[PDB]
Design a protein around this ligand. Structure first.
Ligand SMILES: [Cl-]
Ligand SMILES: [Cl-]
Length: 129
């Protein structure tokens, strides 16, 4: 599923991501656009043999199981296919665990390099939230 910008903002708000760990919803919309272009089915392979999955591009070396990242953790306790669903609940729940692990949203490179220090609220502007 390829989300609309205000559609995703609304679905993130429903799932408790607005102001979660002090991050306003713009930051979530922003890191979704530049990681996955709002496509829940985005996958990308990393150099080390791990894979990023879903609308936030969550990494198999630490958070999910794809059965092909030898010696990786499953700290969100989910198969990585579950992040590719049209229902973002699994992605949101894992993302709450990630952002709370100490390093904030800097875990997401594309948030660090393309959203942080920006007027992130522009990403929710015009939306009925
Ligand atoms: Cl915002
Ligand atoms: Cl980047």
């Amino acid at each position: 599923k390829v989300f609309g910008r205000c559609e995703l903002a609304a679905a993130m708000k429903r799932h408790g991501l607005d102001n979660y760990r002090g991050y306003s919803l713009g930051n979530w919309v922003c890191a979704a656009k530049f990681e996955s272009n709002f496509n829940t089915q985005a996958t990308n392979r990393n150099t080390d043999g791990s894979t990023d999955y879903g609308i936030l591009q969550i990494n198999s070396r630490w958070w999910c199981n794809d059965g092909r990242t030898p010696g990786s953790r499953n700290l969100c306790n989910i198969p990585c296919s579950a992040l590719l669903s049209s229902d973002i609940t699994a992605s949101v729940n894992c993302a709450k665990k990630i952002v709370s692990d100490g390093n904030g949203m800097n875990a997401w490179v594309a948030w660090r390099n393309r959203c942080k220090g920006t007027d992130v609220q522009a990403w929710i502007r015009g939306c009925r939230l």
